[PDB]
Design a protein around this ligand. Structure first.
Ligand SMILES: O=C(O)c1ccccc1NC(=O)N1CCC(c2ccccc2C(F)(F)F)CC1
Length: 174
């Protein structure tokens, strides 16, 4: 008995696109199904003149334990009536050829310290999420202050994802 229905998750009240800009380092990850960035994950969010928020995403993958390649993406967030909620068109540009549409939600952040991003791709009949990913973002790759830790641990819980995040390696490999 703990509402895991996606339609009832709180996102970030009054999300300030532009404050959210600059570099963010993923430090922990909840994975979706199939292929995905594995580590050395780094996001670069920006907003152009109009208010269009877009971002790039750079990280490492392993395909068949034969290859270690640096994937490289670009996303563009269309808006919605929730400022914390977006539709994200993303694609590859390097080696990477895929295109996709994922929901992009900022669940909580303070633009200076940390950020919790989240994305459901599949709803079960009962409303819960069937396939989701989520990133613990940090402005400083050496970690989050004690206050941000407490909030991330709250949100992960509120997203019915606690304990399903694994930490992310960063070692210049890309
Ligand atoms: O989704 C797949 O099918 C996939 C397959 C193989 C390799 C990687 C994959 N996908 C991802 O790794 N990601 C994480 C990055 C994310 C992205 C891309 C561009 C700009 C911002 C973001 C952000 F919103 F996640 F930050 C797109 C989904």
């Amino acid at each position: 008995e703990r509402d895991c229905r996606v339609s009832s998750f709180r996102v970030k009240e009054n999300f300030d696109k532009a404050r959210f800009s600059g570099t963010w380092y993923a430090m922990a990850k909840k994975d979706p199904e199939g292929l995905f960035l594995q580590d050395n994950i780094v996001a670069e969010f920006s907003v152009d003149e109009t208010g269009q928020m877009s971002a790039t995403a750079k990280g490492r993958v392993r395909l068949l334990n034969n290859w270690d390649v640096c994937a490289d993406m670009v996303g563009t967030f269309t808006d919605t009536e929730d400022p914390a909620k977006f539709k994200m068109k993303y694609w590859g540009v390097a080696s990477f050829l895929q295109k996709g549409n994922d929901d992009h939600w900022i669940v909580d952040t303070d633009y200076d310290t940390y950020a919790v991003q989240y994305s459901c791709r599949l709803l079960n009949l009962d409303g819960t999420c069937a396939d989701s990913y989520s990133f613990v973002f940090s402005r400083d790759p050496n970690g989050l202050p004690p206050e941000a830790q407490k909030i991330v641990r709250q949100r992960q819980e509120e997203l019915c994802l606690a304990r399903q995040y694994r930490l992310i390696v960063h070692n210049g490999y890309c």
